[PDB]
Amino acid sequence: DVNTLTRFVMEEGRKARGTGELTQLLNSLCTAVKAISSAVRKAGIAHLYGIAGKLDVLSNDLVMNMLKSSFATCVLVSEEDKHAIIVEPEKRGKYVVCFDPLDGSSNIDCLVSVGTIFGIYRKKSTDEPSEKDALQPGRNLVAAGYALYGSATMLVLAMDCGVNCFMLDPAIGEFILVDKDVKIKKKGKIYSLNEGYAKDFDPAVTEYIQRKKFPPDNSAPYGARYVGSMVADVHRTLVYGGIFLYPANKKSPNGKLRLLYECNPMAYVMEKAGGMATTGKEAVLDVIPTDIHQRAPVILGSPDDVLEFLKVYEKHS
Amino acid sequence: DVNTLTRFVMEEGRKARGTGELTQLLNSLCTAVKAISSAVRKAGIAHLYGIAGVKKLDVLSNDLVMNMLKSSFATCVLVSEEDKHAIIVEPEKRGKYVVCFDPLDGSSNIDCLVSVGTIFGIYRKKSTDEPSEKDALQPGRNLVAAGYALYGSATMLVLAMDCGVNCFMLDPAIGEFILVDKDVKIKKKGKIYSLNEGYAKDFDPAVTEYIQRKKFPPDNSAPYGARYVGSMVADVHRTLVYGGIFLYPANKKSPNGKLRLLYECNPMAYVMEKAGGMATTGKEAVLDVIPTDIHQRAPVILGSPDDVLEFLKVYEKHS
Amino acid sequence: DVNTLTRFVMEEGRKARGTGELTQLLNSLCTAVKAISSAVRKAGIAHLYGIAGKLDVLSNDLVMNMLKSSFATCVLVSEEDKHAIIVEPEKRGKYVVCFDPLDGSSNIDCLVSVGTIFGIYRKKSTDEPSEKDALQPGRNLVAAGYALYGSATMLVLAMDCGVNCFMLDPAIGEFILVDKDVKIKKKGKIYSLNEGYAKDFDPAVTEYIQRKKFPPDNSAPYGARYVGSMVADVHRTLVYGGIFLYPANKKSPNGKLRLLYECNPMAYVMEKAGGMATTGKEAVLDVIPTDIHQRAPVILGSPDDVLEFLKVYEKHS
Amino acid sequence: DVNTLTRFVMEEGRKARGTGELTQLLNSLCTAVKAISSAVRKAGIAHLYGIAGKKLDVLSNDLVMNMLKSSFATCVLVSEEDKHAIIVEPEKRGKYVVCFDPLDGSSNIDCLVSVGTIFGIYRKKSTDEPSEKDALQPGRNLVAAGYALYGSATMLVLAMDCGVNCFMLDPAIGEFILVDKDVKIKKKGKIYSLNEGYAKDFDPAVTEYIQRKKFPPDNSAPYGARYVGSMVADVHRTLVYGGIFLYPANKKSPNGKLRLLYECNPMAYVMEKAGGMATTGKEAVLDVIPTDIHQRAPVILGSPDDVLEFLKVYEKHS
């Protein structure tokens, strides 16, 4: 029996007897995602080229304005904005949203896959809302996921009930539920990172990579895949299994990806799917942030693959 | 002044005073591509999941390309990645062109929504014999037109002909390919290398040396970045747009590479060379290989000319 | 501040502190309507004509299956089905829905406007669901409206709070609120009926129309419009004012249009917009039905116009 | 075997061994029509209502004007939206003259009534410098004419010397698919179409003819009545279902209401190529020699038997 994202979320929200605010949040977010998808696939591009005589900016505006007008949020943190955005009192709800409106858009000139990442916290304190309300560890997440604008558009939504995948049918502008209660493979056959930085690798990374090319137990070498867009690489990791790494290097001694709106949502999706996500020293979701734009190293994916990396890492202290 | 793919092609064809057959070819090809794009983006998927109470995409794409080319009255021999033998067009629909295509390259991993694409190469039938598979056994040098459609974050048709390379963006609101990049030229040297390094234990020694030169530059230069989508159209297109180098080389286990010459290597080599880039097997230009089997494989290394030349120096250094 | 149908209905539903079932129903119907629109605009027709080598039934299937799977309905009455459709026990909700899935589709070969008409009732008794639960007078309506597949696609939704109009943005599949709390003109300048059947007119109908063409005073005659598709004609009546008639005559003493899923929803929209809708003998919404497919004469529109018709109608009674 | 509009026109163009200029015109027009369709169906309206924080008839006119100019096929363009004819700049001049109504019926688009685009295409006949006079040709001189109907779906009807062909816009791929080949209208229909709101102004022939439709003197069944009020919608129904369409003169419109250059002549061309008729009462619409690009004309068109029946009544009243 068919189901849509909005209907699925309403049915779960009613079972839980919530106020409805989270459903309003998510529905508004979905409206923003469908709007971004339409622009990313270049609907209307003919008008820009004169038929009748920016993209990361528009995506950010779409998310900001739909979340503000949902009456469900109070603090908004985006990759695009230096400081947290405080929702005006007459539109304030109880939820905090950290998002990357068009992740990977730096290389969008080659039509690489792009996406939107989001993580949702409930505001905890009785104080007036402020940037400090976004400085929660990932354990505190209420919901997280991403929209992938790849060969098709897909929304992956992780909540405490698990992970579910919804395909955008653009003929009717509806997210169709296509993969329920998704679990990642225990172990995969693909590893994913920028090997251009081989010169800067920690020794633990270098050894782990050598095990994938020259397997010590006589198994077959892993394949290598690296789109260079986090949402595409993570979603392949979810679908086919395997492991994704953005460890520390010389240009990025704390890694390059951002903790609040890149690492935490993907880590949350992995763990709800039976996967893992580590910085090397701890779980990503346990990192207590002190800066909304702070960076974090990330290694995630199938549990056997991450655990193997952690064994190698532990060997190097 | 705005321009669309069809009109751009009509204006060039009229200037050249051709019969119109090639324009009819290209127009039918674009229609199948618009149909492929719509299925790839999962238009109508709600019906598969029971909203009202079916072929895999590579099968449907092959049917779309096949049926539009046959019904274009411009073709006589069609080679597809999907079919063991060439298709001979029925006499009442026969035109003068030979088309080799890959209808949905990269679709094996479309379950993760990776970029996919369509690759095509167009030849003039040269012999006066009855049309046959032998008419597709032409070297890449003989191509009249070649290109690809990339179904990525957006859909783009790249069309290379003797006049150069032009890029057309599909506006899905109106189903028209909008001309957005005219007479495109690749960077002389790039900063990205692209290949499956998981198989490093099987690398040819020249591939091992060249890749290490990229990671640990001997001249104190900055190392290159690495990108490998695993879908040829996406990787080659990034190579065209940002410059750099793409490798699917031969090794001991794969002495002739993995990619297919007629409808993967030749069309991309033609696009590269028209953009001021290069494309080599290691031993020669890809477009100079004289094929003997429509599904034969070929090693390919392509991209910015300085990068390809650097590879070829290393390849020669290993005798 | 932008608003969509889903967001608008959730917000009223929260103010009203309801269980959420009605919001679930309407969201499901909305999805069916987007699906009908896509098929009506002939998306994918290329495949029907061989590029790779019914419409009213499909629309009926879309509505039936979306409503059944909403867990909000228990009895479904459609123009397309001889008997009421009883929702299976494990999916039964509290609402009764009467609809015409593709009204006007008889002339769809000429690309005429078509539409979907719906009316929603609360099941009143605790008995086992049966056709009898749909035999409520239009006065009992919880919500009613229509979707018009015209030059664009619009959903007109009438409830106790008034009538609101939503434009389908097909680029993102969202119904945008574009006209809030709409009211009909007190008096209009357009009359609408099939004059080809003039020889069968009731004598009061003949006189009233003659007064529209040959006003006994010094005013200008009314204009005439008749699309032949009820959703199209009633929506024009709502937007521009005026009067729409499908009256009774000697050969059709009860009219031809159907009460449960054409006359009552349109009469309800009219009354919530400050209009009127009469059979000649009483308000349409006061008719107590005895058969789910029963017919009812209907005259509706701007109140001064409807009241003028009743004046002429009394003279011949 | 499937066929599209562009493919259908090229194949006929190759057979005719013409230069390609008309094919270039028509392809450009079809591109503007798809852009109009997308706008008319309100794609992107969410942005106009603030999702991120031109009137339709003006936009449509811009789309046709700019696509035809850039086609290198036209020299004089006449539009319902512009007071004077537009002369194409010299470096873009081709041989064709185009009269069009970019969004006919848009006056009542607030109620989502069907709207449409009407076009008629002429070869420039005079060798003088291009000017407004190059559009003052009788409809008999048309090379191509037709319309796009933005109704429940979008359909393009194309009439040429070879006959009338109907193409359905599949919005999933932005392609016009051939769905009705070489269309012929019914010899006689059962629907008449006109604004009876002007009954007090009808001349006696119109009054008698309508009375014959409601009270048939042969005791046959009355015709049904339909009047959308949008010309493209009413004419298309007439073409598909047969019957008769009327917009006669009245007191507000002593020379008729509909426009000769880009409403009456193109529909008259489509009707006659479909085996129908289209008359002013005094002569065939296509025989009227215009003197002013926006001049009006009375029109009665549709199935041949129905028009011929009207003309007998017209003859009876002298």
Ligand SMILES: Cc1nc(-c2ccc(S(=O)(=O)NC(=O)Nc3ncc(Br)s3)cc2)cs1
């Ligand atoms: C996939 C999953 N979703 C949830 C979930 C979603 C939303 C909430 S909520 O707090 O927003 N409550 C809420 O919406 N109630 C409602 N009343 C009427 C309507 Br209609 S929806 C609570 C839980 C849990 S697992």
Ligand SMILES: Cc1nc(-c2ccc(S(=O)(=O)NC(=O)Nc3ncc(Br)s3)cc2)cs1
């Ligand atoms: C981008 C470029 N395209 C070409 C090109 C394209 C097509 C041809 S052709 O042989 O097909 N001739 C042809 O179509 N003539 C025509 N007659 C009437 C119409 Br309308 S089009 C020849 C050259 C060269 S560079």
Ligand SMILES: Cc1nc(-c2ccc(S(=O)(=O)NC(=O)Nc3ncc(Br)s3)cc2)cs1
């Ligand atoms: C336009 C208008 N709509 C209504 C209306 C609609 C639905 C209902 S309801 O009974 O379904 N309750 C309901 O949905 N509660 C909710 N809780 C949380 C969320 Br999120 S929605 C009640 C009233 C009145 S005027």
Ligand SMILES: Cc1nc(-c2ccc(S(=O)(=O)NC(=O)Nc3ncc(Br)s3)cc2)cs1
């Ligand atoms: C449906 C119908 N269309 C016509 C028709 C259309 C266009 C012309 S034309 O003068 O433009 N010539 C022309 O296009 N030649 C071409 N050669 C190759 C290509 Br490719 S196009 C002439 C006649 C007649 S009935």
